[PDB]
Copies of this chain bind each other. A is one copy, B any other.
Amino acid sequence: GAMNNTIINSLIGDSIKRSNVFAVDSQIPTLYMPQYISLSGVMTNDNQAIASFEIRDQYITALNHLVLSLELPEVKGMGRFGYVPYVGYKCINHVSISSCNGVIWEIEGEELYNNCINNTIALKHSGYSSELNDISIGLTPNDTIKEPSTVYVYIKTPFDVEDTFSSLKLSDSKITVTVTFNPVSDIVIRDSSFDFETFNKEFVYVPELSFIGYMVKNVQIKPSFIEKPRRVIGQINQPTATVTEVHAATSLSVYTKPYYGNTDNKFISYPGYSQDEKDYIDAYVSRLLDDLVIVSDGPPTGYPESAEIVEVPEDGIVSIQDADVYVKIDNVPDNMSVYLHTNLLMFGTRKNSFIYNISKKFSAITGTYSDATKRTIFAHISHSINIIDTSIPVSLWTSQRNVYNGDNRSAESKAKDLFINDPFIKGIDFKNKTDIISRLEVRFGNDVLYSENGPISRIYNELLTKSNNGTRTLTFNFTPKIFFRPTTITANVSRGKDKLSVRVVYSTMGVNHPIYYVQKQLVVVCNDLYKVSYDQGVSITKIM
């Protein structure tokens, strides 16, 4: 109801100099006015799509918070079609910010995405919705698969960190923003039935650039520093990569990307908008089940001769070598039996060695046959399918290496396979869950800068940046940005110490996984420090 006597007695019962924590002198700031400015741009096909935006106005003193709008068209026709999650980020191949004196800042599309991955709002705007990312089906040539939509891509820049204090100042200079787009093939998930040829011919990127402009009265410009991300991709299947000309790096990131060039980029399933590891696994199990347990009158027809479809015993247990599969379906008609496809997908490099068989990954399958729809309605499924199984390209099941067929699904099931060309996949699975780096070594010149076995550098990245999707990262700067010059690793060119060399030991994937034959590329990102000066327009100088 009021302050207690014990508290009152503990204070009254003034000799020392105290900092006022109950009042502040409200400083008058620089006089300015912000404005959201939107620009249309010019489209070019060098046949890569490139959008240019020129910002040249005597009243736009500073700017930040770049947002790119993209108009997605109405998608009509036959077939399965869906956009990749965060489709807007996946459109971007490269972003460049330039003045008359050259590039001020630039970034690779995947690195922009990596920098925004911990911003759920920016990712949502990108966008990510059941409307965009579920795999929709067109049943007629004039059927609407996808309605037209607008996505917003937040182009995070070093100018956003401290709002007005970090904004790009325009020294009565012309700024150009150049966005290079990925082919539309990257952002779209589709089956064979979908007329991609026509879609590709007719699709056009329709972008618009927004930014927060500031009209500042008597701006007092000071020099600053900015970090420019630089990326190097290693050779296919080489466990090494080098970044040359490293003189002042604030950080270094290391990750892996799969390379699907030895494939047709076709996968059995995709979960759509639902993106959890369990959603990927459930979408895959769901696609296999129709061919795995068959309720038929006599041995099931329409499967390759290589298929081993066995009638389930009265026991319910089918033995596929060491693995027992318990199959029990209720309401099976008297003229019909329950069959198990014991080798739905199988892989082996040697005829009497190890076999990777997807049918062996199921231990229990129960359900009820429906006389009304003539389908089996699966109830409980016990299995050991993982995220890697859902990430195996179909090409690797039917590869030359494989001594077996070894894709014994029905023709109906194979026609439902999807082309996935997402350009920002990491690791060897869709969720980048499996850590395939067993050991990492970083060399600065000839000296070992850092080495680790487990991903403790990923744990630090995730803790320090409050991200649940980090990468193995070394950070050399722990100083607050903008108010301090960033701390860096510094070169010694005479001792040949001006290169960062990364070496990894990859995990053997275990014994005979078809995912061992997924080609990998090592990615190394280095953040170089640059000085930003505004003497005769905006200019940047690499720190050396």
Contact = CB atoms under 8 A, between A and B. Distances in A.
Interface string A456-476: 110110111011100000111
27 contacts: A2-B215, A2-B489, A3-B60, A3-B490, A4-B448, A4-B450, A5-B447, A7-B35, A9-B492, A11-B33, A18-B28, A19-B29, A20-B30, A21-B480, A22-B62, A22-B214, A23-B165, A33-B487, A36-B457, A36-B460, A65-B463, A65-B464, A119-B466, A120-B468, A121-B463, A330-B371, A332-B372
A405 B59 CA distance: 61
Contacts of A480: 21, 163
Nearest to A216: B22
B4 A459 contact: no
Contacts of A25: 222
Interface of A: 1-14, 16-39, 57, 59-62, 65, 67, 69, 119-122, 124-125, 130, 150, 152, 154, 162-165, 167, 169, 210, 212-225, 249, 277-278, 316, 328-332, 366, 368, 370-373, 377, 379, 444-445, 447-450, 452, 454, 456-457, 459-460, 462-464, 466-468, 474-476, 478-480, 482-485, 487, 489-490, 492, 495, 497
Given A11-B31, A11-B32, A12-B217, 8 more contacts: A3-B35, A6-B447, A24-B482, A67-B459, A69-B454, A121-B466, A130-B277, A368-B370
A127 B264 CA distance: 37
Contacts of A460: 36, 65, 67, 210, 212
Contact of A31 (B18, B69, B450): B18
Contact of A222 (B23, B277, B329, B332): B23
B489 A33 contact: yes
Nearest to A221: B23
Given A17-B28, A460-B65, A454 B221 contact: no
Contacts of A39: 1
- Integer count of this chain's copies in the complex: 3
Task: Give the one of A29, A475, A480 with max B CB within 10 A.
Answer: A29
B490 A449 contact: no
Contacts of A219: 22-23
A533 B531 CA distance: 38
Given A2-B490, A7-B33, A215-B2, A222 B24 contact: yes
A18 B2 contact: no
Nearest to A366: B373
Nearest to A464: B65
Given A217-B14, A444-B6, A487 B20 contact: no
A163 B541 CA distance: 29
Contact of A28 (B220, B463, B485): B485
Task: Give the one of A4, A457, A489 with max B CB within 10 A.
Answer: A4
Given A69-B454, A463-B154, A1 B449 contact: yes
A429 to B, nearest CB: 14
Contact of A456 (B16, B21, B67, B162): B67
A140 B52 CA distance: 65
A22 B167 contact: yes
Contacts of A448: 4, 6
A389 to B, nearest CB: 15
Task: Give the one of A8, A17, A277, A489 with max B CB within 10 A.
Answer: A489
Contacts of A497: 6, 10
Contacts of A122: 463
A19 B26 CA distance: 10
A330 to B, nearest CB: 5
Contacts of A278: 130
Contacts of A32: 11, 21-22, 478, 487
A26 B165 contact: no
A241 to B, nearest CB: 18
A22 B478 contact: no
A155 to B, nearest CB: 11
Contacts of A12: 217
A297 to B, nearest CB: 18
A11 B121 contact: no
A443 to B, nearest CB: 9
Contacts of A332: 372
Contacts of A331: 330
Contact of A468 (B37, B121, B277, B373): B121
A370 B459 contact: no
Given A213-B3, A463-B122, A484-B26, A163 B454 contact: no
Contacts of A316: 372-373
